[PDB]
Amino acid sequence: SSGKEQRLTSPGRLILLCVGNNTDVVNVSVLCRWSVRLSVPSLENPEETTAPIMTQG
Amino acid sequence: TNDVHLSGMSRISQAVLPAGTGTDGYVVVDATIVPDLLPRLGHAARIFQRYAVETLEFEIQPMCPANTGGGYVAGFLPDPTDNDHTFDALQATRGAVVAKWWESRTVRPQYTRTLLWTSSGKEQRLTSPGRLILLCVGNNTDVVNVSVLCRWSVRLSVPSLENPEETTAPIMTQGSLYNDSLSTNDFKSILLGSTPLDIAPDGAVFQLDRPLSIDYSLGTGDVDRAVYWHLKKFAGNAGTPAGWFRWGIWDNFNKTFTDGVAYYSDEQPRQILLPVGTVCTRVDSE
Amino acid sequence: GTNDVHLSGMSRISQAVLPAGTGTDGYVVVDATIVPDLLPRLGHAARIFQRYAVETLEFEIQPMCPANTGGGYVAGFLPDPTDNDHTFDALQATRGAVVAKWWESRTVRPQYTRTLLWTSSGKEQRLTSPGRLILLCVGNNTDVVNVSVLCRWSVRLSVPSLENPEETTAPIMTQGSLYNDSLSTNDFKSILLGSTPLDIAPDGAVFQLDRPLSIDYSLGTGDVDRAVYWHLKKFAGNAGTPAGWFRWGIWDNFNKTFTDGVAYYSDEQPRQILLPVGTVCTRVDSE
Amino acid sequence: TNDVHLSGMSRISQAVLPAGTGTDGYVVVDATIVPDLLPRLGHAARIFQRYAVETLEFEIQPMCPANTGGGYVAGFLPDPTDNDHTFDALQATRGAVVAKWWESRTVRPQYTRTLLWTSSGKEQRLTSPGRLILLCVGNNTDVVNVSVLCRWSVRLSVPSLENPEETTAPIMTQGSLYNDSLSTNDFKSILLGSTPLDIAPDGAVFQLDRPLSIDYSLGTGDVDRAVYWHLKKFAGNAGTPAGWFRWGIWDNFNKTFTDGVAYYSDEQPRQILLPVGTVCTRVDSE
Amino acid sequence: GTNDVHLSGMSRISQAVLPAGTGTDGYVVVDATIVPDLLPRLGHAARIFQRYAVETLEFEIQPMCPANTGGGYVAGFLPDPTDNDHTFDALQATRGAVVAKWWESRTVRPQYTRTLLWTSSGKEQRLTSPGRLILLCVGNNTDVVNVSVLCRWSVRLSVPSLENPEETTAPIMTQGSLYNDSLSTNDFKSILLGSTPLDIAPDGAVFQLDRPLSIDYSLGTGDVDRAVYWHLKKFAGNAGTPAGWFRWGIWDNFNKTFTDGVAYYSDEQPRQILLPVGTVCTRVDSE
Amino acid sequence: RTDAPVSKASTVTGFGRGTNDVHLSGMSRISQAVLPAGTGTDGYVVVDATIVPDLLPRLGHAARIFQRYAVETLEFEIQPMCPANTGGGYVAGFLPDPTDNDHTFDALQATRGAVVAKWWESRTVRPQYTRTLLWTSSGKEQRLTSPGRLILLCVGNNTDVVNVSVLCRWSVRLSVPSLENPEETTAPIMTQGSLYNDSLSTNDFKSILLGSTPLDIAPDGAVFQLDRPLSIDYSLGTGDVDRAVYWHLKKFAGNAGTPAGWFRWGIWDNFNKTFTDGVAYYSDEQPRQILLPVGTVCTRVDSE
Ligand SMILES: [Ca+2]
Ligand SMILES: [Ca+2]
Ligand SMILES: [Ca+2]
Ligand SMILES: [Ca+2]
Ligand SMILES: [Ca+2]
Ligand SMILES: [Ca+2]
């Protein structure tokens, strides 16, 4: 369930930046291979499970 | 060591649900667990900043005649953030129990068991191990006077002196307040969808984390806008059991409430004033 | 030495000057909320890693004044950073708390819970800060006291990162209710909020709010409109009012500059609270 | 102990050498190794006075299409004093590498491994273990955007607070400035023969360790002499890629530049103004 | 006992007197760059050997003043002799650094890297000096403070030599830019450079420069010539200007005497810097 | 059977793997003097040689391939040639600081190894030296490129001509592989004499005036460069006093009448390896000026 502090619901974020100027079209895809263990039994409505987003403008 | 262990058994809360009121789903206690709510621990917590839960059990204790023939479900939800009182949510928890109104039962929850703070803060996952909800499962035939007891043991860690108006649990709205639901000076508590607010005594004062905007007029056909951050509970009675809230100004030094400006509705567009998830701390002394 | 380092140092936390006779029982002389940035050598290290955990804290008071001054103070470390109760009894409750004469240095040696913290500030503050050192008077000071507070610290920095110099300063909770009675058309007094971090903030400073500042205005025509501002800017106080004043408006962010954008209307309105106790004022300006 | 070990990987520098520019010899990065240049270490060094190098490797990382068909040579010269960017000088060092522009390579230098200072000083053999130079070996067909990465570990020794304008590496001139090469108000950066100066951003201010003498006139046919110690870089563009320098006065308190007097040439004898080996520290904040 | 000796002693580094009310936050009261000669018993030993390495350093502050004085100071040992940043925060960063009231003696106990040094001074100064002790104010001093700074040292002298008494004194880096606006025809103010070693240097003193002092002049005829001087001489300051003044010219070296050789022209010229920040002024006079 | 790529990969294999160390040794004459009878008054500093690979010829060349060197053994021999009836005395010793400029009998005897003897006897000076690793390329600090200097002073007055020769027997280990141009491998030299603009000629000046034992016995056509600028007072030709700034000198050989020689200022154009001469000094009623102060560092820049 999402909360007020994000440091508690996400382990961090994956960012990818350009390093030069591409001469051509670039088709990048970024795959995450995960394994995780779910600990506590409960029923959480899908409205609260979403991640919060901060504007930067 | 500097740490202090403390254990006791204490009434978390007591509801009376009268004859015939109440129907499957009807939330009859919704209590966010924090030391203030646990009587003897209440005072111990006022001394340190940090507590950690060592043991927690709730013993349900309902009082009615043997022929009462209703029912309840109880349980403990570990997420003080999770705001979902449905039976399905409860039945999903560990500890959860069901019984007839005349039967006591003991819920044995699973809880955080880690180091928490005594005084309230932004993220309330650090102030509480969870919350206990008890609901109706049928229609109660008779008056039941349910008293839920909690046997608890805790570890208190760093010494401190704590402001008692800070120790209280923040209450969250469950329902939106629309501008078209305001009376001239007040509105019905039930709109906010919150049992703890609905049962907060007469004269409780609450500060909001979101502004309450009140459109008013000088009486010239001219609409103006005011802002308020405080509400006062005006007690509920048989006709309006949830009671009412007046907006206004809380003076924190003098500890006094002043009612705010009258609402004037004049062909305004539909608006959301207090969205669901508005937070409401008790700021008045107890 | 890839991920963990121990650093120790000591560093000035804050300096205050009490004019003669200023201050009284309970006058708050310094409320310093702790964060790696505020302590100088450390702040550089906390920019390298994004996690830190405190291992020793100690504060030395070192107030300087003549031997005759004869007022008093009390200092302590208050481990909740959330805790805004600045009463004497609540300060003396803190472990290590010391009370002495203005011409006596002392050393407060507290206990803290030694959790892992974050360097970059986020929403919940008990995850970015071990607490806040408070110092307050206990009598009238007879002479000018130029008090410096030092902090001896050792700390363990943990996760390699490179932070941006903007996110590191910790926000400020307002302590007092700002009524609209107290407004002036261009600006308002700092002391009204009652937060000593705001009261001391240097001029040309800009603070973003978490709640909206609602400004009344009119171009003319005897007509009252209503406007909204999320920012504040500090304009330095003068001997008459040391508090300083706050001017609202617009902090263009791409710009790197403030625009006052303040219009007010003083009229017969019903008394209102624009920015209530608990309003969170983050420092947004250039650094 | 009081000593602090620190390790990381960090971009030492990044050049773009565009299409067709650049020819065997063309120095594309010349970076004097000091902690300021290494980003994360940059901040750690601002705290102590002394650092010592434990490990150093540079990983070259060029970015271009596979068909680029130029080439480079890289290496690490251990003498921060030695001022010789030729291929032959590089090929003599240990670690040195050569490759096509599309290939990354890792230079493994040998370095002092002894105790050095964080802040700059007269003898720069105590501030730096050496310098890495990367040159062209052919003519590059395409745009290459080379990003040279350095994996480093160091030991930092005595705590201190360091003025950041002092931490920077002094740049040395490679070519003499002659009086007859001055324009009325400026001169071309390329004359000084220094890549780090040539690529220093617009508005960089530098102090010289040698006086810049400017002959001027009042406009009476009377030649007079002025002295200046500061230069301001005015950015280079496609027409003049090295850019230009104006002499003048740097005000250290206000952190401002004032342009100096115009140069007047009037049948003067040949003169050397700024001999090769003139030292040029960055004084302006970054 | 042919080559190595241990010596320990303690010795006065410097004395300063602050007139009443002189000094303010950050006023630099004493900047003493350490060298065997400055410490008296040692200086005699360092004449015998040509290599020395420091094993313990400790400074005791001992300022003398009335109990009421009530300003403050901060003192520390700054191990780079090259470091010219004299800010408070930069001094408090130094290990062992102490802050106290003007009527409190203190002891600064630092860490130093304990390298082998040279006794005879040469170009790079981090090979002749372990660093420099700095002391500066932290408030306005109410009374006259007559501060003495002591230094307790133990050191290891290593290579047998016999030095000449002229090479042993360490040179001085100028801190401030000397504009030609500030010139007077016969002399200039010492405070403009901002180097406390220069500001304090006793009169009749002679200092050679590493950069050229460019003096404008004219015999007459409304004609501006240009001249060059490498030297300076100190002429004592007076209560009105404590800084003192510097008079350029010629230090005949066979002579053992100064010759002013100063000519100036004050005219409409474009503002210039004759001696910029970092100018090295070596003490050349007789000893 | 491999496919055709867009680009093959580099195959530049053995690169950056050059020979690393070399021990190397020999014995080299480090100076020679001849003193006619009257000269050689007590204390006359007959010799003063700052030790640097370049002074030891064979070594000097090897040193242009490595960046460091460290001394493994040194001794000096003294070996004056003169007959038994010469009644003068000398004193030699190696000063382990290359910067130390005070040459007194007292300051030598103080040095470990130092020797004292009448002119007709040979002597070996077994000195004390750093045995750490210095640099081959010259630098700003001398303490880092030289282990010290060997000085030899007269002790009485020679009755007769003295033919002293001073040989240095060395062994050294060269540490770091690199390529160092012969311009930077030269040793810097400090003047010990002020140059006044009253003591001048239109285009040159005396070398004894600078008061430096090296610059005195420096060779012909030898272009130098300075750290400090030189101020030359020239003219437009209207009785006008203008100012000129030159950085470079040129050595011209000396005489039996003028032991040391001349020094013509000018311009060392390094791009093209040539030397222009400096403008006609304007003699004038100009205030007395020290053009180059005591301690001016002069570093040789022309091709060696
Ligand atoms: Ca949940
Ligand atoms: Ca608390
Ligand atoms: Ca972070
Ligand atoms: Ca330093
Ligand atoms: Ca010496
Ligand atoms: Ca070299």
CSV table of C-alpha atoms in Angstrom, one decimal, chain B residues 2-3 47 49-50 115 117-124 126-127 157-164 166 207-211 213 216 218 222-230 248-254 258-261, chain C residues 78-85 87 89-91 93-95 111-113 115 123-127 129-130 175-177 179 210-212 214 216 222-226 268-280:
chain,number,residue,atom,x,y,z
B,2,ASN,CA,18.2,2.7,29.7
B,3,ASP,CA,15.2,0.9,28.2
B,47,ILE,CA,7.8,10.3,29.1
B,49,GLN,CA,9.7,9.4,22.5
B,50,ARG,CA,10.0,5.8,21.3
B,115,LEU,CA,10.7,0.7,17.0
B,117,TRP,CA,7.5,6.9,18.0
B,118,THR,CA,5.1,8.1,20.8
B,119,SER,CA,4.2,11.6,19.3
B,120,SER,CA,2.4,11.8,16.0
B,121,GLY,CA,4.2,12.6,12.7
B,122,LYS,CA,3.7,12.8,8.9
B,123,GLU,CA,4.2,9.1,8.1
B,124,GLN,CA,2.0,7.3,10.6
B,126,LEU,CA,6.2,5.0,12.5
B,127,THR,CA,3.7,6.0,15.1
B,157,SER,CA,13.3,3.7,24.9
B,158,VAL,CA,14.4,7.4,25.2
B,159,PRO,CA,13.3,9.6,28.0
B,160,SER,CA,11.3,12.6,27.1
B,161,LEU,CA,8.5,14.9,28.1
B,162,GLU,CA,5.6,14.8,25.6
B,163,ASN,CA,3.0,17.4,24.7
B,164,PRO,CA,-0.3,15.5,25.2
B,166,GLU,CA,0.6,15.7,20.1
B,207,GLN,CA,-7.2,21.0,12.6
B,208,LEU,CA,-7.1,20.0,9.0
B,209,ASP,CA,-4.1,19.5,6.8
B,210,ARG,CA,-6.1,20.9,3.8
B,211,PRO,CA,-7.9,24.2,3.6
B,213,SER,CA,-12.7,27.2,1.6
B,216,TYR,CA,-19.5,34.1,1.6
B,218,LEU,CA,-21.3,40.8,2.3
B,222,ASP,CA,-21.0,39.9,-4.2
B,223,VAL,CA,-19.3,36.5,-3.6
B,224,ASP,CA,-16.0,36.4,-1.7
B,225,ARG,CA,-13.9,33.5,-0.5
B,226,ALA,CA,-12.6,32.7,3.0
B,227,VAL,CA,-10.3,30.0,4.3
B,228,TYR,CA,-10.5,27.9,7.5
B,229,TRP,CA,-8.4,25.2,9.0
B,230,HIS,CA,-10.4,24.2,12.1
B,248,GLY,CA,-13.9,28.5,12.4
B,249,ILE,CA,-10.7,29.7,14.0
B,250,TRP,CA,-8.9,27.8,16.8
B,251,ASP,CA,-6.7,30.2,19.0
B,252,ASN,CA,-3.9,27.9,20.1
B,253,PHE,CA,-2.8,30.2,23.0
B,254,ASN,CA,-6.2,30.8,24.6
B,258,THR,CA,-14.5,31.3,17.1
B,259,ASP,CA,-17.2,30.2,14.5
B,260,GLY,CA,-16.4,31.3,10.9
B,261,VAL,CA,-18.3,33.1,8.2
C,78,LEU,CA,15.6,16.9,21.7
C,79,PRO,CA,15.7,13.6,19.7
C,80,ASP,CA,12.4,13.9,17.8
C,81,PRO,CA,12.8,16.4,15.1
C,82,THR,CA,9.1,16.6,15.0
C,83,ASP,CA,8.9,17.9,18.6
C,84,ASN,CA,7.9,21.6,18.7
C,85,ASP,CA,7.2,21.8,22.4
C,87,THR,CA,9.1,24.5,27.2
C,89,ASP,CA,10.5,21.2,31.5
C,90,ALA,CA,10.4,19.5,28.2
C,91,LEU,CA,13.9,20.5,27.5
C,93,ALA,CA,13.6,16.0,30.4
C,94,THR,CA,16.1,15.3,27.5
C,95,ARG,CA,19.1,13.3,28.6
C,111,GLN,CA,21.2,9.7,24.0
C,112,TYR,CA,19.9,9.3,20.5
C,113,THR,CA,18.6,6.0,19.0
C,115,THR,CA,19.1,4.7,13.4
C,123,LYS,CA,8.6,13.8,3.5
C,124,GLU,CA,9.0,12.2,7.0
C,125,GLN,CA,11.6,14.0,8.9
C,126,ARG,CA,12.5,11.3,11.5
C,127,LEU,CA,14.3,9.6,8.6
C,129,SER,CA,17.3,13.8,11.2
C,130,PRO,CA,18.5,12.6,14.6
C,175,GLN,CA,5.0,27.1,15.3
C,176,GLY,CA,2.4,30.0,15.3
C,177,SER,CA,-0.8,30.8,13.6
C,179,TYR,CA,-3.8,35.6,11.3
C,210,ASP,CA,3.3,23.1,1.5
C,211,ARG,CA,0.0,25.0,2.2
C,212,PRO,CA,-1.3,27.8,-0.1
C,214,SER,CA,-4.2,33.1,0.0
C,216,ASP,CA,-6.7,39.2,-1.2
C,222,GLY,CA,-13.9,48.9,-5.0
C,223,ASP,CA,-13.8,45.2,-6.0
C,224,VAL,CA,-12.3,42.3,-4.0
C,225,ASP,CA,-10.7,39.4,-5.9
C,226,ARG,CA,-8.7,36.5,-4.4
C,268,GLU,CA,-13.9,44.5,6.7
C,269,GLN,CA,-13.5,40.7,6.3
C,270,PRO,CA,-14.1,38.0,8.9
C,271,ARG,CA,-10.9,37.2,10.9
C,272,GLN,CA,-9.1,34.4,9.2
C,273,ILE,CA,-6.0,32.1,9.6
C,274,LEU,CA,-4.1,31.9,6.3
C,275,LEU,CA,-1.1,29.7,7.4
C,276,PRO,CA,-1.9,27.6,10.4
C,277,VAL,CA,0.4,26.1,13.0
C,278,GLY,CA,2.3,23.2,11.3
C,279,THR,CA,2.7,24.8,7.9
C,280,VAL,CA,5.9,23.3,6.3
